[PDB]
Amino acid sequence: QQDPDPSQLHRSSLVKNLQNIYFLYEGDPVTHENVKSVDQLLSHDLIYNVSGPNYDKLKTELKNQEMATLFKDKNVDIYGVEYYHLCYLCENAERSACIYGGVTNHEGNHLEIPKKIVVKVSIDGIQSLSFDIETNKKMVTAQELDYKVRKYTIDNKQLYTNGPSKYETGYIKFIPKNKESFWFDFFPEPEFTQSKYLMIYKDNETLDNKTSQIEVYLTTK
Amino acid sequence: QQDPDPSQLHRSSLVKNLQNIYFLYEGDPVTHENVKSVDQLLSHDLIYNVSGPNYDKLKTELKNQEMATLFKDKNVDIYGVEYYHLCYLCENAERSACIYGGVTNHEGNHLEIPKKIVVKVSIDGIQSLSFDIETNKKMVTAQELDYKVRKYTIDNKQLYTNGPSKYETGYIKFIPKNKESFWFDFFPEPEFTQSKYLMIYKDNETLDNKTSQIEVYLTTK
Amino acid sequence: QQDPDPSQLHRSSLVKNLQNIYFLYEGDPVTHENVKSVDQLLSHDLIYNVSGPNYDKLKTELKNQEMATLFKDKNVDIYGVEYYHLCYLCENAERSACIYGGVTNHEGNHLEIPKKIVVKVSIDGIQSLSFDIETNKKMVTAQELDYKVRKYTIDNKQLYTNGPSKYETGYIKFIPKNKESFWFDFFPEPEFTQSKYLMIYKDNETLDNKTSQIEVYLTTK
Amino acid sequence: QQDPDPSQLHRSSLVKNLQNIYFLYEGDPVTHENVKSVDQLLSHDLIYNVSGPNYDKLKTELKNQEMATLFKDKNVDIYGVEYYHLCYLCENAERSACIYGGVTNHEGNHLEIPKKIVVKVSIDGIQSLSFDIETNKKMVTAQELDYKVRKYTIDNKQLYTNGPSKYETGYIKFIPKNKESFWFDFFPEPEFTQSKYLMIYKDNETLDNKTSQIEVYLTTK
């Protein structure tokens, strides 16, 4: 998925209700360890009886029925950026949260020593700096890492606010060692929803954290 | 409103998902001072551009169009028990909260010193102890008084928990000076939703707090 | 009930999307004979696996838990005014229909030949129209008779159109023999929902069709 | 669409509620000629003030923001398989219908005489039948042609029933003179929703009806 050409990046200043992007990235992510599914709603999601602040039932929509049946009877670890508005999990659940992807096998995936990852960060075409992020998994979802990056960038250089952004465009690029690199745009469409926007994590793309690489590109104005 | 015949109270051991009542009275209420509505969905509701931890638009459903148009353009104070599940306010709002009633005119309703109200509590027929709640309004909603009552007994007598209750039945009774006593059952029907249950606050019933009385009847059954 | 003051009646000229009331009463009602409930979502409702043009699951919301368990294991006949928008039944049902009340015991309730009931229509204080409706039930819901009456004047006197009504106010008055008269206002509040408006049927009010009388009062403009 | 691998096809006998695919193709399609969008909910959709039975507001979801804006101000023709369950268009619309794609420019896309297209059907490896479908458009969406192929095989060869299908697997393959051939699975995943399934039409794929071929492949258990 070679890189976006300028015109291909969503312009933050046309976005309406941009704060709903901020709330996803400024808050805490959903994280659970050594859990196993207890039901599913469609054939391509799995439902977990886990709890966090604001929820006690968590649904994740994966790539298709084959990925879901895969993880269904497996103890896994989860790390997702959740939403509530338009989250659908069970007719009787009043405190549910939803994510896409963020699923990995627990058995064996744990790192005693946490791998630190360099985040090369560019602005208006020049590298302005970098920062490290850390993960405890040998094989991590690209989602878990895109979040740690945006959370840091939000609180350190105001990537998102409860309001307008400073940057016009932005995307994060995951350059695996092995195949095709791939990117995510930091801004949604003018009129969007948190659930449609997060579909970027639905592919459950997981990648070797010792070998991969992370680049971020932003523009001002 | 004749007091509950015993076969008229809801049995807690029959409630599915009773923990959803717990979250309502254990968490903080929604409060705003001297605010004005900015819109409405239906004729009997009012929408406020106000914020709290998980929302930034708040809707109150009042008794009928009459009552909503009565407060529509007034500066009011809001004291309410809010819900998110099944809360509908606007097609574009992704961070909404909803309540029933809880509205009092702001201007001239403030007490300079809080008024204590004695709350008598009975368990299996015996007067077991009294505690006080407080309010800053001369005219307060039964709702504000009911929430403070239930918050205090959830954290001190374990009225509710994330799971079953010590108690089989319970209700709170208001005895106004000027008129008819009324009461609210502390447990919903077996299969309920928080929005349906909170409708006890829809009529926006308000009391003179200097002269109101509160009694609570709980059974251990 | 006390007959309505003109100030109590809703002015149709104030209604937004009045055409939503038209579709309810121009369309076929939902009817089924000798059936029994198979489930329920909440305690005040009953679900029937019965079919019509556009649905294969039908939910009826009754007065309270008491009334729903009263009819839960009985063979009943159903006669309702249904809606789709905001109809909630089951997470797995994509073709649902919803009504309020309209439920009657089937055993012994059928009449050999239809019982005709006269409907007196006053327009602006002058009663120069009479028409009949008929039912196959000895104890019929007000709902059934009311649909009957509104369907007839929608097509005969243009009570409703896909647009405004030539009538400003209008209401139907049921007059039982033995007990209390009561009425339904033909127009809803300015901004409403079909689900909200149809609650006039939730109490499942049933009467003797041999003896009950019907009057309708409309005002032009 | 690389032609399907036998393991890539969805087996109809695993599907829960296959009748919900049946009602989409046995029912009439939504068709409108020379209409112009009027609004939009999200950037990738367009809403049309058009009617049909059961609806008076129609929404189509296209590929993305660029596609909605391409047709936004255009007079277009619409031909789509509509759904109601989980269709959202507006907070005030109680009668809406939704589709994916199905949009073609109106201007000079019409044909004096319907183009007749021969449909090649194979069943378990042998081509046992050919029938004709027809379109009035020069450039027609694949959606429109699939609808006609399917309405035909439902009514004549039992492709779908209010119950299971006579076929275990099924797909339709489109072969455009020029570029890449593509195909659609006649069957959904086991637990599905109509809304998710119909996304096979979201990309609004369109082809020249004079030079595109339709081929149908079915297997029995």
Q: What is the DSSP string of B67-101?
A: HHHHHTTS-EEEEE--B-TT----TT-SSEEEEE-
Cα distances (Å, whole numbers) of residue B197 to B21, B214, D23: 9, 21, 37
Which residues of D lie inside 8 Å of A (Cβ-Cβ)? 40-44, 64-65, 189-193, 196
CB count, 10 Å around CB of D105?
Answer: 16
CA distance C105 to C114: 18
Cα(D139)–Cα(D110) distance, integer angstroms: 9
Q: What is the DSSP letter of D168?
A: S
Experimental technique used to determine this entry: X-ray
Q: In this structure, what token pair is assigned to residue C44?
A: 């005040």
Q: Are A143 and A102 in contact (CB under 8 A)?
A: yes
Mutate to test the interface with B, among C62, C66, C189, C197 (most CBs of B within 10 A): C189
CA D88 – CA D51 distance, rounded (Å): 16
- B149: nearest Cα among B121, B175, B176, B124: B121
In order, the DSSP letters of D57-121 are EEEEE-SSHHHHHHHHTSEEEEEE--B-TT----TT-SSEEEEE--EEE-TT-EEEEEEEEEEEE
- Contacts of residue C126, defined as CB under 8 A and 6 or more positions apart, other chains included, come to none
- Tell me which DSSP letter residue A69 carries: H
Residue owning tokens 């019907």: C214
A15, A164, A202 from A26: Cα distances, Å: 18, 14, 21
Token pair in block for residue A120: 């090369």
Q: How far apart are CA A107 and CA A76, in angstroms?
A: 7
Which residue, A188, A187, A179, is CA-closest to A206?
Answer: A179
Nearest CA in chain D to C87: D85
Q: How far apart are CA A175 and CA A180, in angstroms?
A: 7
Question: In 3-state terms, chain C is what percent helix, strand and coil (to 5)?
Answer: 20, 40, 45
**Which tokens sit at C7?**
């100030």
Q: Is A221 exposed, middle or buried (0-12, 13-18, 19+ CB in 10 A)?
A: exposed
Gap between the Cα atoms of A21 and A17, Å rounded: 8
- Residues from chain A contacting residue B194 (CB–CB below 8 Å): 94
| Tokens standing for residue D10 | 């969805």
Q: Which residues lie across from A31 on neighbouring strands? A: A79
Helix axes D19-26, D142-157, angle to 10 degrees: 110
Sign for the pseudo-dihedral over CA of A202, A206, A209, A212: negative
As beta bridge partners, residue D216 has D121, D172
Q: What is the C-alpha radius of gyration for chain A, rounded to an integer number of angstroms?
A: 17
Contact indicator for D58, D48 with CB cutoff of 8 Å = yes
Q: Please report, for residues A51, B57, B69, D38, D41, the alpha-carbon distance to residue A55 in angstroms, rounded to integers and kept in the order given.
A: 6, 20, 35, 38, 28
- The distance of C78 to chain A (nearest Cα, Å) reads 25
- Rounded to whole angstroms, the Cα distance separating B143 from B156 reads 20
- Over its C-alpha atoms, chain C yields an Rg (Å, rounded) of 17
How many C-beta atoms lie closer than 10 Å to residue B112's C-beta?
5
CA angle D152, D155, D157 (to 5 degrees): 85
Chain breaks in chain D (C to N over 2.5 A) after: none
* Nearest-10 crossing angle of helices B142-156, B19-26: 110
- Closest C-alpha among C91, C82, C113 to residue C41: C91
Helix (H, G, I), strand (E, B) or coil at D136: strand
Please state, in angstroms and as integers, the Cα–Cα distance from residue D105 to each residue in A41, D29, D51, D74, D78, following that order.
38, 18, 19, 7, 9
C chain contacts of residue A88, beta-carbon cutoff 8 Å: 91
H helix or E strand, kind and range, residue A20: helix A19-26
- What is the spatial distance between Cα D197 and Cα D188, in angstroms, rounded to a whole number? 6
Give the C-alpha separation, C214 to C146, whole Å. Answer: 9
DSSP state of B103: E
- Angle at which helices A19-26 and A142-157 cross, to 10°: 110
Query: Running DSSP on this structure, what letter comes out for residue A4?
Result: -
Which element (helix H / strand E) includes A156?
Answer: helix A142-157
Single-letter code of the amino acid located at C10: H
> What are the phi and psi torsion angles at A201 (to 5°)?
-100, -5
b/e for D4-39, b at 16 or more Cβ within 10 A? Answer: beeeebbebeebebbbbbbbbbbeebbebeebebee
Maximum CA extent, chain B: 52
The rounded distance, in Å, linking the Cα atoms of C71 and C82 is 19
Whether D119 contacts D159, CB under 8 Å: no
Would you give the DSSP letter of residue D153? H
Cα C83 to Cα C89: distance, rounded to the nearest angstrom: 12
Q: How far apart are CA A150 and CA A201, in angstroms?
A: 14
How many CB pairs below 8 Å do chains B and D form together? 7
Give residue D134's Cα distance to chain centre: 15
Asked whether D37 and D189 are in contact (CB, 8 A), the reply is: no
Q: Which residues of A touch C90 (CB under 8 A)?
A: 91
Q: What is the full DSSP assignment across B171-218?
A: EEEEE-SSS--EEEESS--SS--HHHHGGGGTT--EEETTS-EEEEEE
> Phi and psi (nearest 5°) for C130?
-140, 145
Cα D141 → chain centroid: 8
Closest CA to C171 of C156, C187, C157: C187
Q: Which residues contact D137 (CB under 8 A, 6 or more apart)?
A: D77, D104, D109, D110, D111, D115, D144, D209
Q: Do B88 and D91 touch (CB under 8 A)?
A: yes
Question: Alpha helices of chain C — where are they, by DSSP H?
Answer: 19-26, 65-72, 142-156, 194-197
Contact partners for chain A, using 3 or more CB pairs closer than 8 A, are B, C, D
Asked if B215 and B128 touch (Cβ cutoff 8 Å), the reply is: no
Those residues whose C-beta lies under 8 Å from the C-beta of residue D79, and which sit 6 or more positions away, are: D29, D30, D31, D102, D104, D140, D141, D143, D144, D147
Q: Is D128 helix (H, G, I), strand (E, B) or coil?
A: strand
Chain C interface with D: residues with Cβ < 8 Å: 16-17, 19-20, 23, 54, 56, 83-85, 92-96, 191, 193-194
CA pair distance C35, C47, nearest whole angstrom: 11
- B135: phi then psi, degrees, rounded to nearest 5: -150, 155
Instruction: Confirm if D90 and D42 have CB atoms less than 8 A apart.
Output: no
Domains of chain A: 1-26+109-220 (3.10.20.120), 27-106 (2.40.50.110)
Set of chain B residues whose Cβ sits within 8 Å of the Cβ of D91: 41, 88, 90-91
d(C-alpha B193, C-alpha B196), whole Å: 5
Residue A193 and residue A98 in contact, taking contact as beta carbons nearer than 8 Å: no
CA atoms of A88 and A84, how far apart (whole Å): 8
| Interface touch C193/B43, C-beta < 8 Å | no
CA dist., res. D175 & res. D170, Å (int): 17
Residues of B in contact with A95 (CB under 8 A): 20, 23, 85
